[PDB]
Amino acid sequence: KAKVKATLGEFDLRDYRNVEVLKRFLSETGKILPRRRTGLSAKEQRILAKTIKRARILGLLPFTEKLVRK
Amino acid sequence: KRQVASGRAYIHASYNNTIVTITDPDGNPITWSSGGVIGYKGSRKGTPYAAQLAALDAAKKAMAYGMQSVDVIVRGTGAGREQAIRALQASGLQVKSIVDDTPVPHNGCRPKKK
Amino acid sequence: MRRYEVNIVLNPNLDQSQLALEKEIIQRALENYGARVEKVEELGLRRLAYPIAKDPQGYFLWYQVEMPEDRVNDLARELRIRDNVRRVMVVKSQEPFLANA
Amino acid sequence: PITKEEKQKVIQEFARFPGDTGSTEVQVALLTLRINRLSEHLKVHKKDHHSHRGLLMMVGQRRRLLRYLQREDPERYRALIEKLGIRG
Amino acid sequence: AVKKFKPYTPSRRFMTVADFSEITKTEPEKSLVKPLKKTGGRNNQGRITVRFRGGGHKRLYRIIDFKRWDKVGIPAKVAAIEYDPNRSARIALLHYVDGEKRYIIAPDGLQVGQQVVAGPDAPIQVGNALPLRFIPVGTVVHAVELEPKKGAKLARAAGTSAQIQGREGDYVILRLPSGELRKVHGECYATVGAVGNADHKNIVLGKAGRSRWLGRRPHVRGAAMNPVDHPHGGGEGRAPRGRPPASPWGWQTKGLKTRKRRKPSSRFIIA
RNA sequence: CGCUCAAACAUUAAGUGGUGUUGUGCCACUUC
RNA sequence: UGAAAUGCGCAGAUACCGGGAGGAACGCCGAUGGCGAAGGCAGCCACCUGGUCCACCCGUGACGCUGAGGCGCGAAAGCGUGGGGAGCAAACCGGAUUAGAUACCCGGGUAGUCCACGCCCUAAACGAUGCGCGCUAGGUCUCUGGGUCUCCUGGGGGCCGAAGCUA
């Protein structure tokens, strides 16, 4: 389909406060998108996950959303 | 309990039965059906046709309660899964919106010997 | 002496007399264990992502200080006691790692 | 950890000539700080066996360097062993 | 933890005694308003209401500030972790800058020289005493009141404590040194932290004597006696219980509940 | 019709047991 | 559950909403991946800490390698003392199966699994490959560090194969 990273701008992937930004890797499922959807790299991928959970404890990034229509 | 408009049906699909419940927009069971509210016993209850009959039964009694518009939230993985919803189409009850909220742990309690 | 990004959340369902009575206890608290307040932001109430304490709102604070590390724990410890202080997360501050530079 | 500036304090008091950061002196003295630094840690961190591995390794290396520094020039060794209060 | 012994003698290849490394090099109890005479091997009529007592060691009671509210917000620098021969725990002779000196059960985590104090404005900090309303949920806490202005009397044994489960109404829920989830009025005082000498349970008396020094007399078994004395009276060979195991007064002895049905305190306890 | 038994018989290459079914009183394991 | 039965349920169960207690374990990331001497190691936060890698060619100046004995670490089960106990669970009882079923399958179930402290010191403790160093074509995938970089240069994990080795 498309690359998430290739829809945004220049963003520090360590500010666990920019929800709008981070949330875009969260999936309409609440699951930390796999590598082959976000289009990240090794290094990058892990610290992204870092500041993810870091912000999930701040009620900022949803843990899980029951799937929509089915 | 009272005759109301909106609502919400709950598909609990096991593997040796499947159950559901009509419940007011608050979350409290108005009516409910299963594989045994169908008569079929044992394994029969793991059946889609049993599920059709379940949903039909469930929703059926809702329409006797003035029920019309109902949301949907299902859990499990029973052979009557989708079927418990597709019966809820030819039910006359507006499937206002269907949703899946099957329980799934971040992995914690160690599982039975299977 | 090290750089940290202390985080906090507040009970959203309260005024500004008790709220400006609350922030002062984090102040008094910090200065107790030598915390040197730097660039402090405040994003107040916030439509939370999952219900905490049954209220989907939480008044966010955010600090960033230089302080003695061997007491960085006992700073956080202190912070949580207030029953109106819901969330507290101390972390060590770090450089902007770039993404899509 | 060990402050880089209180680390230079070490080389300074052990450098057998400015511009020196390799003399077995500076090396022994070094490991010692790391040793005792690590010794103390494990004192109240007894469970940390992992870390004890190192405590042996840093010691071996120090005991080795001390072998040579004694085997080559004895007089200098005597002065060191005392400054560091070792060999007990 | 505890001092063992080489077996230079039987009843001494098991018997251990606590390492009083916690005691603040102190023997003389504060002769001050602290130690007063103590006695009584049996009840007021010259009778016996508790088999097997006496033979003590001649003891002085140590007055203990349990209420601790008559001195709110008056800081008292700790002075002494003392031995007290009337509890599972040590005592802590504290001194207030008010001059006057008192005594408090020695909690776990008590060094000598803490700025401990009573009252609610006091920091929820080990050794500090305050009403539960101010102590957050989960906080461990000893020497607990039961009804306001009445005094502590819960969790006062070595290493015993109560945890706070939550608030409900004007009461707070405690999981007692037993797991009894009971409500207790908020305005009741406590003492943040658990109790000291927790390491005491692991003692082993060792010999008869040690028992006696305590005052516990030799307790003679039921079936050792005669049909005249005790229900188990058969004594006809090491012979079994007639059934069902029972007290020297007849009441069954295993699993017979005895708390009175309708003590008005039931409505204040769960499980 | 259901229930217990000692045989004739049937299932297997064979054995064993089981069982099937009549008669009677009321697929498993093994082949030196 | 292959079908059931024991089991549980008009004591109002199953399913559902809300509140609380409790324990253990960390979904997605997450992997052909990382680290560790080995055993082994996954929420996150902090502190304490070992090892390790690259660049600079600055420092000492053969101070190295191995290593009987000794010393320490050492999955799991197990053992002592105390705490803890939701889930799982030998043993244990029950249902079925079976000629029999101490088993497979199912319902229930205790020690244990978890914590501290101590002991235990075993193993398909497996790469079934002791360690250190020099030498002998390359291709490709990945992890990681440096370098103006469709490329070289170190380190680590795989596959394929020069030479050679091999029963």
Q: Which of E1, E45, E51 is nearest to E204 (CA)?
A: E1
Cβ <8 Å between A68 and B73 = no
Q: What residues in A contact B101, CB-CB < 8 Å?
A: 66-67
Distance from CA of A70 to the nearest CA of C (A): 23
Q: Does A47 touch chain C (CB under 8 A)?
A: yes
Give the closest of C43, C89, C101 to A10, CB-based: C101
Contact with chain A for residue C46, Cβ under 8 A: yes
Pick from E147, E99, E93: which is nearest to E268 by CA?
E147
Establish if E124 touches chain C: CB-CB under 8 angstroms. yes
C33 chain-E contacts, CB cut-off 8 A: none
Find out whether B72 and B97 touch, Cβ atoms under 8 Å: yes
Q: Which residues of C touch E136 (CB under 8 A)?
A: 81, 83
Beta-strand relationship, B69-76 and B8-9: parallel
Going along chain A from its start, the domains and CATH numbers come out as: 1-70 (4.10.640.10)
Per the CB < 8 A criterion, the answer to whether C94 and A14 are in contact is: yes
**In which residue are the tokens 């591995």 written?**
D53
The residue whose two tokens read 């005694």 is: E17
Backbone angles phi, psi at B23, to 5 degrees: -145, 135
Reference E145, options E134, E129, E160; nearest CA is E129
> Which chains lie within 8 Å of chain E at 3 or more CB pairs, if any?
C
Q: Which nucleotides of chain G does any protein CB come within 7 A of? A: 1-5, 14-31, 33, 36-39, 43-51, 58-65, 72-74, 81-82, 86-90, 105-107, 116-118, 142-145
Residue C75 in 3-state DSSP?
A: helix
CB proximity list for E263: less than 8 A, separation 6 or greater? none
Which residues of A fall within a CB distance of 8 Å from C49? 19, 56, 59-63
Instruction: State the residue range of the domain holding D80.
Output: 1-88
Domain count within chain D: 1
CB-CB contact of E69 with E118 (8 Å): yes
| Of E22, E57, E90, residue with least CA distance to E212 | E57
For residues D23 and D12, what is the distance between their CA atoms, to the nearest angstrom? 12
Chain C positions contacting chain E at CB under 8 Å are: 81, 83
CA distance E28 to E8: 32
SS3 E137: coil
Protein residue closest to G14, using CA and C1': B19
Cis bond upstream, residue C12 (ω within 30):
no
- Subunit contact C83:E136, Cβ cutoff 8 A: yes
Q: Tell me the structure's resolution in angstroms, rounded to a single decimal.
A: 3.8
Cβ A14–C100 below 8 Å, yes or no?
no
CA dihedral for D53, D55, D60, D61, sign (positive or negative): positive
What is the Cα Rg of chain B in Å?
14
CB-based burial of residue B11 (10 Å sphere; 0-12 exposed, 13-18 middle, 19+ buried)?
A: buried
Joined tokens for residue A69: 């229509």
Helix (H) or strand (E) holding E80: strand E76-82
Establish if C12 touches chain A: CB-CB under 8 angstroms: no
CB contact under 8 A, A69 and B97: yes
Size of chain A, expressed as the number of residues it contains: 70
Give the residue with minimal CA–C1' separation from G47.
Answer: C70
Chain C: residue nearest E138 by CA? C81
By C1' distance from the Cα of B37, the closest nucleotide is G14
Report the distance separating Cα B91 and Cα B87, nearest Å: 6
- Structure token pair of residue B101: 């909220």
Chain C contact present for A28, CB below 8 A = no
Give E-chain residues touching C81 at CB under 8 angstroms. 124, 136
Helix H segments across E89-204? none
CB atoms within 10 A of CB B67: 25
**In the structure encoding, which two tokens stand for residue E137, read together?**
């949920």
H or E segment to which residue A38 belongs: helix A35-38
**Interatomic separation, CA of residue D48 and C1' of nucleotide G120, rounded (Å):** 20
Asked if the Cβ–Cβ distance from E124 to C81 is below 8 Å, we say yes
Report the distance separating Cα D22 and Cα D20, nearest Å: 6
Nearest residue to nucleotide G4, by CA–C1' distance, is B42
Which nucleotide has its C1' atom closest to residue D67's CA?
G63
Residues in A lying within 8 Å of B, measured between beta carbons: 64, 66-70
Domains along chain C with CATH numbers: 1-97 (3.30.70.60)
Count the Cβ atoms, other than its own, within 10 Å of residue D7: 14
Show the tokens assigned to E238: 């090491």
Closest CA relative to residue E118, chosen from E108, E131, E106, E103: E131
What is the CATH number for D36?
Answer: 1.10.287.10
CA→C1' distance for B47 and G137 (Å)? 65
Kindly tell me whether chain A and chain E come into contact, counting contact as 3+ Cβ pairs under 8 Å: no
Residues 74-103 of E with CB under 8 A from C: none
Q: Which chains touch D (3 or more CB pairs under 8 A)?
A: none
CB-CB under 8 Å, B101 with A69:
no
Question: Longest C-alpha distance within chain B, in Å?
Answer: 46
